[PDB]
Amino acid sequence: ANPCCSNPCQNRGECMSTGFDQYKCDCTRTGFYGENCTTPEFLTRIKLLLKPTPNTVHYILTHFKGVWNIVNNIPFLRSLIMKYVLTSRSYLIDSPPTYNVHYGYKSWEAFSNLSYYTRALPPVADDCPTPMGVKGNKELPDSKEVLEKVLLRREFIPDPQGSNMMFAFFAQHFTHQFFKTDHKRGPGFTRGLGHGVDLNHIYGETLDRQHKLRLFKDGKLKYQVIGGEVYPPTVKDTQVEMIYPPHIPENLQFAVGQEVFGLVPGLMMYATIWLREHNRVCDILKQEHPEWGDEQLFQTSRLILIGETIKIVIEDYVQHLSGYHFKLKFDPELLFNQQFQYQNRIASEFNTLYHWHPLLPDTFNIEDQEYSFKQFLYNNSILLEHGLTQFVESFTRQIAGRVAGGRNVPIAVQAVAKASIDQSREMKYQSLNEYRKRFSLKPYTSFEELTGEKEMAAELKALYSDIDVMELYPALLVEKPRPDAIFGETMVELGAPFSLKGLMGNPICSPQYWKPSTFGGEVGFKIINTASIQSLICNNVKGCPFTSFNVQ
Amino acid sequence: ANPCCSNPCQNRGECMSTGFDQYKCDCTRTGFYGENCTTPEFLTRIKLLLKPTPNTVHYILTHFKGVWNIVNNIPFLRSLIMKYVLTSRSYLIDSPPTYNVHYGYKSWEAFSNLSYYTRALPPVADDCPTPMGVKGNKELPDSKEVLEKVLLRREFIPDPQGSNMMFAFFAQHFTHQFFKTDHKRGPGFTRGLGHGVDLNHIYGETLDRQHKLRLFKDGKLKYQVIGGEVYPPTVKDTQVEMIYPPHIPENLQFAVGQEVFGLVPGLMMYATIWLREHNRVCDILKQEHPEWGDEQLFQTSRLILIGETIKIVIEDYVQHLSGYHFKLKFDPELLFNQQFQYQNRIASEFNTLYHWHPLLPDTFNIEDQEYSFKQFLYNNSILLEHGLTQFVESFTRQIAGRVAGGRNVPIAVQAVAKASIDQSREMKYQSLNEYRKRFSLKPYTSFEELTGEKEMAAELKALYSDIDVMELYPALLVEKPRPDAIFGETMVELGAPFSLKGLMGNPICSPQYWKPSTFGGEVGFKIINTASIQSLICNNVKGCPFTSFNVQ
Ligand SMILES: COc1ccc2c(c1)c(CC(=O)NCCCCNS(=O)(=O)c1cccc3c(N(C)C)cccc13)c(C)n2C(=O)c1ccc(Cl)cc1
Ligand SMILES: COc1ccc2c(c1)c(CC(=O)NCCCCNS(=O)(=O)c1cccc3c(N(C)C)cccc13)c(C)n2C(=O)c1ccc(Cl)cc1
Ligand code: HEM
Ligand code: HEM
Numbered sequence A, B: 001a002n003p004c005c006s007n008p009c010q011n012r013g014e015c016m017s018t019g020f021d022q023y024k025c026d027c028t029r030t031g032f033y034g035e036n037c038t039t040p041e042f043l044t045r046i047k048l049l050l051k052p053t054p055n056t057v058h059y060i061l062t063h064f065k066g067v068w069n070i071v072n073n074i075p076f077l078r079s080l081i082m083k084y085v086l087t088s089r090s091y092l093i094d095s096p097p098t099y100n101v102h103y104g105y106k107s108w109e110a111f112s113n114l115s116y117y118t119r120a121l122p123p124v125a126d127d128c129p130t131p132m133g134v135k136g137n138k139e140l141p142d143s144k145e146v147l148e149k150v151l152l153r154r155e156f157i158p159d160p161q162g163s164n165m166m167f168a169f170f171a172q173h174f175t176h177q178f179f180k181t182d183h184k185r186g187p188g189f190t191r192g193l194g195h196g197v198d199l200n201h202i203y204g205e206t207l208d209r210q211h212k213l214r215l216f217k218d219g220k221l222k223y224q225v226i227g228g229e230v231y232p233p234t235v236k237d238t239q240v241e242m243i244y245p246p247h248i249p250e251n252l253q254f255a256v257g258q259e260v261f262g263l264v265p266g267l268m269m270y271a272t273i274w275l276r277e278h279n280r281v282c283d284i285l286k287q288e289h290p291e292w293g294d295e296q297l298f299q300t301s302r303l304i305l306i307g308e309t310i311k312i313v314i315e316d317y318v319q320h321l322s323g324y325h326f327k328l329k330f331d332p333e334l335l336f337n338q339q340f341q342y343q344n345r346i347a348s349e350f351n352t353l354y355h356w357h358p359l360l361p362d363t364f365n366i367e368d369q370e371y372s373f374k375q376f377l378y379n380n381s382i383l384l385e386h387g388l389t390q391f392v393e394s395f396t397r398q399i400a401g402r403v404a405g406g407r408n409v410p411i412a413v414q415a416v417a418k419a420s421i422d423q424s425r426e427m428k429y430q431s432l433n434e435y436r437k438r439f440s441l442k443p444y445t446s447f448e449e450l451t452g453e454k455e456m457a458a459e460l461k462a463l464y465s466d467i468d469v470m471e472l473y474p475a476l477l478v479e480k481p482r483p484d485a486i487f488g489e490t491m492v493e494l495g496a497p498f499s500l501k502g503l504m505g506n507p508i509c510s511p512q513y514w515k516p517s518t519f520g521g522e523v524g525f526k527i528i529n530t531a532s533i534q535s536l537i538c539n540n541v542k543g544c545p546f547t548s549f550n551v552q
């Protein structure tokens, strides 16, 4: 029906219907011309000839350890490299944002309505003959069948990069401030109207929730002491709404910024660590500024914790994941002479990509115990039983699962993996290869090239028939990993642009914010710039246990 | 009290208390160093030596007509000049925004809460000894006395630049989509959450209001035909809430996007013109795209009218006000190789500066009638009586008042001018000379330099005593105008940066939006790029009457 149903325009040109059965491609500033924007300009021919592939770049970034060690110790050179990482990535993102689940064309409603997730690729039009457009059968393969044959875990496959449970729960804690799907509206809708790293999962999404969590003395958050240890306050004491099963004793209904963080003790672990960190910074700021009131202490601490988070995410968390020998760097000043939009809108595809449930082990090993999912979920007495110190030590030792490579989703959350398939289709996602072309990646020509093996590929070929109809979400979890890596190419090359845009797009990174007085002076500024996952745990967890994002 | 109360930091450095009675200035990236950021760096000394004053630049832009005529006809050169206008202006604006009425320091609440107007200068802290900080008496002069002695109109002073009533009501109509003070909360709060040119005054601020105004056929807005002429629908037919006195007959309660536009027939005139323009573009787009639905026609029309508005504002409206011989140009492509933030936050000071009530005449002259304020206000039967054609012809002929120069506020709206004084103090505005320094202007050293005359200056000196205590709002309306100009230096140099940021910061000006397919192809794109105030009236007002922003 829709003459744009076949995605005819290439190289990021836009398709517009010019009639019932005709189309036009807008090749403006794509570097290409022609009916579908496939004829390259002369300069585009040069750039294409000289541009290395992501797999070639990945090889260089993870080898030549001696060379990278020299680069890392020459600040001019390390700064120059990190700068090209930041800019060349963010060019892949439309900012200001464009499409969403309901708009395949730009509109003021799509731009201005913050309740939507944005979309990197427009949805497939409702009256297209097939789910992916024109290709494939009239209906996609049964999602339960896709789930069982290539996604569910047989044997636990550990991450060859050594990610531990401190990493897995940090990723879950960190991402759930901007992945907050509004199920009352639909999967393409979010309740995180800040659309980035605003730390609403600590401070609350609304002002009313924030004030219920605050102590209103010295800028601090409310807390309680249990067995000599600082823990978050209760729902009874604060009246903030939290999601808990009906049988949870009210002394165990912990109240934090994010309403679902009582779901898992691993989320509650980091919520306690970051609550402690907020009040620790309040003590630091109060000593520096005896003349300050409660309000300014709270607000300045929040700005500092936002900075710490971005620092830890880039220099520890992304550093770990990447496996690069090059040392990534959080330095907003690198973009001050660059074109860059200090804004962000969370993409649905970013949300989809971040479903890293293969990380989860089959049991959670704390001290000498091994807890099943049923024993673990919604049970914060485990946290009080063992304490934060034992949690950190145990989760630093416990290995997490490999995400790519196939067949590593634990069956305990199989309903979540099926809904990811079902809701991706409900949201009319374009095909895997459409998203690969959208991010300058060469389309896969067979299922065997996608997986790098034969068994899962053949099962996928029987299900999907055509590689161009393969879906984005299952492909990320079955993709051939990089050599001994946690992810395949598609995960890294689609996800890294969304990730750094979210981190660097924050207002505190802009030149009028990135100065010591924003953070209460050089003392507050230095907390941001010296932050690490190790110092986060050391300053706030009794005994200063060693921690890391990888097993040692 | 607050050791920053005296505004000690100069040249846009930030003041932070380091104790009960001591402060520190953050001179980061100001180009200055020293205790109060007054010692210029070497390069800063150069720039200061070579930079012409705004009054010198003004003189050049309004003289040498022969030279400007050559420049205007050399596209490369005209583009280069307009580009430097755009960039050098926007550097004066904090984007992402910083302060607001409740926050004199940067905070996440100030950044993220869209209900606030932002502030170009932080408010004077609550516990400062004087209203302006440390200078002046403990209380500012009686506002009624300031109003009567230097603001109220004796004799009507016409604008020497020839502004007519088409201009005055265009400015009122245009600005009232982003100046919508939320009086339920306070003067530092806004109901225009789009914070710019989103045309909510045509389409409604909320989706629910928009749908009540829409026809849901061919993308069009609801309308009625009275005497063969197209007018907005009624409150009875649409159920959109409008502000009307209780005695207005329901057949005269017109419903438009902005709830207060029934206040004056001049606002209702432009509301009708733009309603007609929306549906006219809907007819154009439907002919180009017979395959399109109602929703896509409406959204694309809205994007086109947003483009037309920015075009008309820059190339007709700002062009008229400026008096330049150089031809200003709306061309988003000029910023594509420039650093620029495609976002905006409406400033409280921009609202204050746009109080152009001296524009209003003592009577409104339509055909042979002269209506008093009492006869004019809330009386749309006047519009139906004469029709749009007679309105345009009459308002093109009627001259408007001079804004600067003093004593030209019509007595009918004296309560509005007093509230501007009162609410400027309630919001703890800094002094006139502080705002001049904030925008790179040399402080006034006497009231006589401010006004350029002797009588009003002497009255102001008896009231304020110290020039450094003179307030921003009254100073704009008494300032010495530029030679035969409508404004003084302060109005232009503070207001032009806010104005162009609002216009160019719009998403439709960003590179991913500024292409023909965003606007339905080259036909919709050309509507934007050929828009003018004359063509707006010609396409939509019977007889295509001549119109202009100046009397002929
Ligand atoms: C690997 O595993 C990973 C895994 C995750 C990763 C990353 C790396 C990265 C680093 C990155 O951005 N990875 C891609 C950029 C590499 C190439 N950058 S380049 O500029 O094009 C370039 C091209 C050519 C030569 C270059 C070069 N030379 C001189 C050889 C040096 C530097 C750059 C060069 C980020 C942010 N992740 C995320 O946070 C992320 C978070 C959530 C999701 Cl779901 C997905 C990702
Ligand atoms: C005048 O009356 C007016 C009155 C209003 C005006 C303007 C001019 C202007 C044009 C502008 O922006 N006026 C200031 C920029 C002039 C200098 N620009 S410059 O780049 O620093 C420069 C510096 C040195 C030499 C230059 C030069 N040469 C080669 C001599 C050419 C071009 C620029 C040069 C804008 C937008 N208004 C507003 O919309 C507006 C709306 C509401 C409010 Cl309440 C207030 C204003
Ligand atoms: C014991 C650990 C975990 C459990 C029990 C769990 C369970 C769930 C459940 C039930 C949902 C559906 C929530 C909803 O749709 O409202 C969900 C969604 C999600 N999961 Fe987890 N998960 C765990 C760990 C993780 C980890 C480690 C990550 C990432 C590193 C992750 C990423 C996500 C994301 C991004 C969503 C989407 C959230 C949203 O869109 O609002 N999960 N998970
Ligand atoms: C007959 C014509 C006019 C009348 C009766 C009028 C009257 C008023 C009144 C009563 C207010 C206070 C509204 C409120 O605070 O809610 C106001 C505010 C304002 N006026 Fe006018 N005015 C007229 C023309 C104009 C013009 C020509 C301009 C500018 C070119 C202008 C600019 C403004 C602005 C910017 C505000 C602030 C609005 C806000 O913050 O919500 N007005 N006017």
Ligand SMILES: *[C@@H]1O[C@H](CO)[C@@H](O[C@@H]2O[C@H](CO)[C@@H](O)[C@H](O)[C@H]2NC(C)=O)[C@H](O)[C@H]1NC(C)=O
Binding pocket: A113, A114, A115, A116, A184, A185, A186, B206, B207, B208
């Ligand atoms: C953002 O878009 C959503 C979806 O259109 C809006 O939610 C709809 O609101 C209307 C009335 O305003 C309701 O009748 C619908 O039931 C809602 N639909 C859905 C799917 O939730 C939402 O109001 C918009 N938000 C803003 C601020 O405009």
Ligand SMILES: *[C@@H]1O[C@H](CO)[C@@H](O[C@@H]2O[C@H](CO)[C@@H](O)[C@H](O)[C@H]2NC(C)=O)[C@H](O)[C@H]1NC(C)=O
Binding pocket: A206, A207, A208, B113, B114, B115, B116, B184, B185, B186
């Ligand atoms: C933006 O700030 C205003 C002002 O603080 C908030 O309005 C207050 O809201 C609280 C409860 O949330 C009320 O008790 C107060 O009466 C309100 N004060 C005023 C002056 O209106 C508003 O909620 C904030 N908006 C958001 C989205 O957080």
Ligand SMILES: CCCCCCCCO[C@@H]1O[C@H](CO)[C@@H](O)[C@H](O)[C@H]1O
Binding pocket: A055, A056, A059, A060, A482, A483
């Ligand atoms: C300057 C020297 C550049 C060397 C280029 C190395 C290109 C490596 O290439 C990659 O090797 C991977 C194995 O590591 C394979 O898995 C990938 O398929 C392949 O593309």
Ligand SMILES: CCCCCCCCO[C@@H]1O[C@H](CO)[C@@H](O)[C@H](O)[C@H]1O
Binding pocket: A148, A149, A152, A153, A154, A411, A455, A456, A459
């Ligand atoms: C939920 C834990 C696994 C459920 C597997 C259901 C069986 C259907 O799946 C089959 O499983 C076999 C064993 O891996 C594979 O060898 C086959 O290729 C696969 O199609």
Ligand SMILES: CCCCCCCCO[C@@H]1O[C@H](CO)[C@@H](O)[C@H](O)[C@H]1O
Binding pocket: B055, B056, B059, B060, B482, B483
């Ligand atoms: C290259 C030629 C430079 C000409 C510089 C002219 C500077 C004019 O200067 C200005 O003149 C105005 C009147 O026109 C006065 O009102 C201003 O106070 C004055 O600064």
Ligand SMILES: *[C@@H]1O[C@H](CO)[C@@H](O)[C@H](O)[C@H]1NC(C)=O
Binding pocket: A006, A007, A008, A035, A036
């Ligand atoms: C792309 O253009 C070619 C001609 O250049 C045309 O044959 C083809 O139909 C177009 N796209 C698709 C999807 O068919």
Ligand SMILES: *[C@@H]1O[C@H](CO)[C@@H](O)[C@H](O)[C@H]1NC(C)=O
Binding pocket: A374, A375, A376, A379, A381, A382, A383, A385
């Ligand atoms: C909760 O955790 C405790 C250990 O602290 C365990 O003994 C108990 O069985 C758990 N409860 C459930 C319902 O699994």
Ligand SMILES: *[C@@H]1O[C@H](CO)[C@@H](O)[C@H](O)[C@H]1NC(C)=O
Binding pocket: B006, B007, B008, B035, B036
């Ligand atoms: C500015 O600094 C000078 C010394 O350089 C100091 O005397 C003065 O007190 C400072 N500012 C004010 C407002 O006093």
Ligand SMILES: *[C@@H]1O[C@H](CO)[C@@H](O)[C@H](O)[C@H]1NC(C)=O
Binding pocket: B374, B375, B376, B379, B381, B382, B385
């Ligand atoms: C309204 O306008 C009409 C002219 O159309 C005029 O005769 C009438 O007096 C006005 N009403 C008021 C209350 O001013």
